[PDB]
From a paper:
The henipavirus matrix protein (M), which drives viral assembly and budding of the virion, also performs non-structural functions as a type I interferon antagonist. Based on the NiV and HeV M X-ray crystal structures and cell-based assays, M possesses a putative monopartite nuclear localization signal (NLS) (residues 82KRKKIR87; NLS1 HeV), positioned on an exposed flexible loop and typical of how many NLSs bind importin alpha (IMPα), and a putative bipartite NLS (244RR-10X-KRK258; NLS2 HeV), positioned within an α-helix that is far less typical.
The M NLS1 was bound in the major binding site of IMPα2 (ARMS 2–4), with HeV M residues 81GKRKKIR87 interacting with IMPα2 through 14 hydrogen bonds, 1 salt bridge, and 131 non-bonded contacts. The interaction interface extended over 895 Å2 of surface area. Lys84 was shown to be positioned within the P2 site, forming interactions with the well characterized IMPα Gly150, Thr155, Asp192, and the binding was consistent with other NLS cargo binding at the major site, including SV40 T-ag and HIV Tat. Interestingly, the NLS1 region is exposed and accessible in the full-length M structure.
Residue numbers in the entry:
A (entry chain A): 74 to 496
B (entry chain C): 80 to 88
C (entry chain B): 81 to 84
Write the structure that this text describes.
């Protein structure tokens, strides 16, 4: 307790394994303190290579543990600190410890590899190349996950989620295929932290091209994801919703699996959720559903979600309102005349017009496109004048006229076109 | 859950 | 269209 770095060095440089153990535990305690652990001072003392060599002392398990914990905490820091651990040779030494007969040492190695992989795609891929996946997955090859210690299982799930994480590049396809069956099993486990990190892992794996989405959807997980979308724990709902959102960015068939699994029945709650980030990500998800086929738009209608989109457009955080505007422009670009009429009957025009007062150029462009699409539907019914009156009555004509004189060229063009054609 | 890196205290 |  409270040793100086100088004393730690003195003990670690002794030729006495027990003196080395005591000094390594003292380093672990220094690195474990709540405020400002002296990571850089330990690195600068040259201690990483010694710690790494201690990981290999099978005949002294306590010093394996203390050095694993010390190196975990060094690797928990900046990229430069994690690099110092990797440059010491720690990756293969930790992978060898995954097979330790001492569960607390195996777990510490799991943790350290999670920090290293969590640094970014290069270290992730280097952990994979040194062969970490097979022994990690072997630790979870039990008939019932509930026999494992809870903290150990949580750490295993977390580390596997970091092997799934990051882009440019995404993880190797073969590694993802190797991990996915275990992730599917963890997604059905009943611990909330395991469920959260399993959802995070799936949200990473579905953040990319449609072929990556397909790898996940083919495993049949969309129904469990929709169940978790309904959980009461916000740490579960957040990544489950991110994963669902990612999936509906894919093909119409991938989106339909989300719809078939019952997801839309959760959106009344998600679109009114008191957490701003949930409302925003739910509305983004809705906008990618309304960019789908007419029969998918129809499912949005049937689930009663158009009033909820009108609500979010009327009042929500601005970022959420922007996603809602997108959802409406997609809806009106893809929908039938009857669907677009319905949108107007639900009260979309006034909140849409109110958002033309925003200082964000992109949302104005989006709203003008939506108004154009609605006017096109009205043209097919011969009701353009009725719509013009509605837009004038709520103050929308004033806002569009003003937008004729707007810095962005596309805004001015769109406004003038609307006025000349309909007003 | 979800953290990039985790320190053990 | 979709937005990733």
């Amino acid at each position: 307790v409270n040793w100086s770095v100088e004393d730690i060095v003195k003990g670690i440089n002794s030729n006495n394994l027990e003196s080395q153990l005591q000094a390594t535990q003292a380093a672990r305690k220094l690195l474990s303190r709540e405020k400002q652990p002296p990571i850089d001072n330990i690195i600068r003392a040259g201690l990483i290579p010694k710690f790494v060599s201690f990981l290999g002392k099978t005949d002294c398990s306590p010093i394996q543990f203390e050095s694993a914990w010390a190196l975990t905490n060094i690797a928990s820091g900046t990229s430069e600190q994690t690099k110092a651990v990797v440059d010491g040779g720690a990756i293969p030494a930790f992978i060898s410890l995954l097979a330790s007969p001492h569960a607390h040492i195996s777990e510490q190695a799991v943790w350290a590899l999670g920090n290293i992989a969590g640094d970014g795609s290069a270290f992730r891929d280097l952990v994979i190349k040194h062969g970490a996946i097979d022994p990690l997955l072997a630790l979870l090859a039990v008939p019932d996950l509930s026999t494992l210690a809870c903290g150990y299982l949580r750490n295993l799930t977390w580390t596997l989620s970091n092997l799934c994480r990051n882009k440019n590049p995404a993880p190797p396809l073969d590694a993802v295929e190797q991990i996915l069956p275990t992730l599917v099993r963890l997604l059905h486990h009943n611990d909330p932290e395991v469920l959260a990190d399993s959802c995070w892992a799936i949200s990473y794996l579905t953040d990319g091209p449609n072929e990556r989405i397909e790898m996940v959807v083919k495993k049949g997980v969309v129904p469990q994801l929709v169940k978790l979308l309904g959980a009461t724990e916000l740490p579960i709902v957040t990544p489950a919703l991110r994963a669902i959102g990612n999936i509906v960015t894919g093909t119409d068939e991938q989106t339909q699996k989300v719809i078939d699994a019952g997801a839309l029945a959760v959106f009344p709650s998600l679109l009114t959720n008191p957490k701003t980030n949930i409302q925003k990500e739910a509305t983004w998800t809705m906008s990618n559903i309304t960019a789908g086929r007419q029969d998918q738009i129809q499912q949005v209608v049937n689930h009663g979600l158009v009033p909820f989109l009108v609500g979010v457009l009327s009042k929500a955080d601005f970022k959420t309102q922007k996603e809602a505007a997108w959802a409406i422009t997609n809806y009106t670009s893809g929908g039938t005349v009857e669907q677009i009429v319905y949108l107007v009957h639900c009260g979309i025009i006034e909140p849409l017009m109110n958002l033309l007062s925003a200082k964000d150029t992109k949302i104005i462009q989006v709203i003008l496109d939506a108004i154009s699409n609605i006017f096109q539907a009205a043209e097919k019914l011969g009701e353009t004048e009725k719509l013009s009156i509605m837009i004038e009555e709520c103050g929308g004509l004033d806002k569009i006229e003003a937008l004729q004189r707007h810095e962005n060229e596309s805004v001015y063009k769109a406004s003038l076109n609307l006025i000349e054609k309909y007003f | 859950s979800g953290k990039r890196k985790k320190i053990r205290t």
